[PDB]
């Protein structure tokens, strides 16, 4: 048997069922595009189960005794095994609605609601968006300006270069301040859509005003194409960096988040993901332990108390879970 919650089982980076999980994730994504959140979660859960299996699923008999594998997810896997293709998945892939929603939602600063509105208004292509600049936020304009580079997978080599310039700027702005790589790259991914950094300082409060100083330093070096700073809850800057490369350059999305050191373990846990892993962890916390977990803390609503954590391990322990390092959180 395999545990029900993704936070109770290791999910490694590489697995034996990538065709099957990809097909179920197409159905999940399509469901999200239609506002069908229940169905999204159900397909995401089923895909996540296949990622945790130790062996390839070669026959339908292998599905026995697995949680979150309802009739619909089973039929999809059955059609793939028997016929090499699932007609429902291929129809989604080929549909203009899905292709356009994928196109729009991929753009920096565009969510499902915005993409759906644009679809309903007859917009289909990136050129259609550029013909209607009054419909775009500044963030979305920047996303369109750099859309080719931003739909080029970010590589580990890009991350290492970016972490060096961010660490240099952070270290020059404030000695003692630290930079931690989070997101999918912390989980061991070889590529990604962006780079996530979490910034703090060991003395509570010394992190105040640090981010704008970091940003000034980076902007002075020609490294910033776009930056949106927001105070609100963590201070963060959603950016597009201009990454120099041999003979050229490429735009790369980078999120910089500042957390006070008291909240750092919660922020690190939340920001490391995966998105599904953290969804499952918060659900586990609430339903199984009566506690409310977020990126800032772990709250007992009965006692009106906050858990003091020094580490991610403290949080797992406090919730009665065996610790999973980041590379086993790839749910
Ligand atoms: N709706 C969201 C969005 C984000 N996150 C958390 C989990 C993610 O791991 C982390 C960083 O978000 P990203 O969108 O950068 O996701 P990843 O870095 O995990 O994936 P990618 O490789 O696509 O960047 O923030 C979350 O829990 N829920
Ligand atoms: Mg990321």
């Amino acid at each position: 048997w395999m545990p029900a919650y993704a936070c109770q089982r290791p999910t490694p980076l590489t697995h034996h069922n990538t065709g099957l999980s990809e097909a179920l994730e197409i159905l999940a994504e399509a469901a999200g595009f239609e506002g069908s959140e229940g169905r999204l979660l159900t397909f995401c859960r089923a895909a996540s189960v296949l990622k945790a299996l130790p062996s390839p699923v070669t026959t339908l008999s292998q599905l026995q005794g697995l949680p979150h594998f309802g009739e619909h997810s089973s039929r999809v896997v059955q059609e793939l095994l028997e016929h090499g293709v699932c007609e429902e998945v291929e129809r989604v892939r080929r549909s203009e609605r899905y292709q356009t929603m994928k196109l729009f939602t991929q753009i920096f600063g565009v969510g499902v609601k915005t993409a759906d509105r644009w679809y309903r208004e007859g917009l289909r292509t990136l050129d259609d968006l550029r013909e209607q600049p009054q419909k775009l936020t500044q963030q979305q304009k920047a996303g369109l300006q750099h859309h080719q580079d931003l739909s080029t997978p970010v590589l580990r080599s890009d991350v290492d270069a970016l972490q060096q310039v961010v660490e240099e700027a952070v270290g020059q702005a404030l000695p003692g301040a630290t930079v931690t790589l989070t997101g999918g790259f912390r989980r061991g991914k070889l590529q990604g859509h962006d780079v996530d950094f979490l910034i703090t300082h060991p003395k509570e409060g010394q992190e105040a005003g640090l981010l704008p100083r970091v940003m000034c330093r980076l902007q002075d070096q020609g490294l910033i194409l776009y930056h949106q700073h927001q105070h609100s809850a963590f201070e963060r800057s959603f950016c597009i960096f201009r990454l120099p490369q041999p003979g050229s350059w490429k735009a790369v999305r980078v999120d910089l988040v500042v957390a006070p050191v008291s909240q750092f373990p919660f922020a690190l846990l939340g920001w490391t993901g995966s998105k599904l892993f953290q969804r499952e962890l918060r659900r586990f916390s609430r339903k199984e332990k009566g506690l409310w977990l977020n990126s800032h803390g772990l709250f007992d609503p009965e006692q009106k108390t906050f858990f003091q954590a020094a580490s991610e391990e403290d949080i797992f322990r406090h919730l009665g879970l065996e610790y999973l390092p980041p590379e086993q959180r790839n749910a």
Side-chain angles (χ1 to χ4, degrees), residues 2-38 40-59 61-63 65-70 72-74 76-86 88-112 114-171 173-202 204-274 276-286 288-301 303 305-331:
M2 188 198 64
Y5 288 94
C7 61
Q8 295 174 313
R9 58 185 188 250
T11 318
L13 176 63
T14 65
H15 65 92
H16 295 271
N17 289 297
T18 60
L20 299 174
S21 65
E22 282 164 10
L24 291 174
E25 282 173 345
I26 290 170
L27 300 181
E29 177 179 40
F33 291 160
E34 303 314 297
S36 301
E37 259 67 75
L40 179 143
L41 295 178
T42 298
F43 287 131
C44 285
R45 286 184 192 119
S48 190
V49 165
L50 301 181
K51 301 175 189 178
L53 294 173
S55 292
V57 173
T58 310
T59 75
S61 37
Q62 293 186 249
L63 290 192
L66 293 198
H68 307 296
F69 236 94
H72 197 163
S73 288
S74 304
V76 170
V77 170
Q78 179 178 24
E79 295 180 33
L80 289 165
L81 291 174
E82 293 184 349
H83 306 286
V85 61
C86 174
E88 185 188 5
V89 173
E90 297 307 298
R91 185 182 314 124
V92 169
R93 283 186 144 112
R94 292 188 339 257
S95 73
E96 181 167 339
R97 170 65 182 188
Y98 174 82
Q99 291 175 356
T100 307
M101 285 292 292
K102 188 144 189 75
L103 178 69
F104 293 166
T105 58
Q106 193 279 150
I107 297 150
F108 181 56
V110 182
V112 168
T114 295
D116 171 68
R117 178 172 42 264
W118 290 343
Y119 191 87
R120 289 185 289 101
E121 292 170 348
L123 299 164
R124 296 291 181 276
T125 68
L126 299 177
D127 193 69
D128 292 340
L129 302 179
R130 296 189 183 91
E131 287 291 291
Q132 312 294 329
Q134 78 287 353
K135 295 188 182 293
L136 313 175
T137 65
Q138 286 299 313
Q139 187 182 14
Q140 293 158 353
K141 285 174 181 179
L144 286 173
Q145 280 164 20
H146 298 289
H147 83 92
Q148 284 196 31
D149 280 350
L150 301 186
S151 57
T152 295
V154 182
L155 304 171
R156 180 71 214 204
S157 66
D158 304 330
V159 170
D160 292 346
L162 292 163
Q163 181 156 10
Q164 291 170 32
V165 304
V166 172
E167 282 178 353
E168 190 277 338
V170 168
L174 182 60
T178 61
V179 176
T180 302
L181 176 65
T182 71
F185 291 108
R186 186 172 176 240
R187 306 195 303 276
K189 296 182 86 191
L190 301 189
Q191 64 188 38
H193 102 286
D194 76 354
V195 187
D196 303 289
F197 293 111
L198 181 55
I199 297 164
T200 194
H201 189 282
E204 188 101 352
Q206 288 299 109
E207 82 293 341
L210 174 55
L211 191 52
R213 294 183 178 271
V214 171
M215 296 308 308
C216 191
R217 290 178 170 274
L218 295 169
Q219 182 78 45
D220 192 44
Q221 299 172 262
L223 289 169
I224 301 300
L225 288 163
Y226 177 84
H227 163 43
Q228 189 176 335
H229 183 247
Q230 69 170 10
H231 306 266
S232 285
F234 289 127
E235 188 177 9
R236 61 181 289 192
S237 180
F238 321 79
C239 306
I240 306 171
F241 281 52
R242 188 186 184 282
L243 174 62
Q245 308 238 277
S248 53
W249 56 276
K250 87 167 152 175
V252 179
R253 287 181 50 165
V254 177
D255 281 351
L256 305 175
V257 179
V258 173
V261 69
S262 63
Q263 297 185 37
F264 176 85
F266 302 102
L268 181 61
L269 181 60
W271 276 86
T272 295
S274 72
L276 182 56
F277 187 91
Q278 287 297 315
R279 186 176 293 114
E280 292 271 284
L281 189 56
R282 293 181 192 192
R283 191 157 67 82
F284 178 87
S285 172
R286 182 182 78 253
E288 311 300 325
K289 304 315 222 235
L291 301 178
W292 300 346
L293 176 64
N294 71 9
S295 66
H296 298 271
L298 179 56
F299 184 68
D300 182 334
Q303 299 298 140
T305 62
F306 281 104
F307 177 59
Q308 180 189 242
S311 73
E312 294 184 310
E313 288 88 338
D314 289 348
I315 299 164
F316 275 85
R317 181 179 296 108
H318 196 71
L319 295 166
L321 288 164
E322 172 149 294
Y323 176 69
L324 288 167
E327 72 275 14
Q328 299 302 327
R329 301 184 202 162
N330 285 294

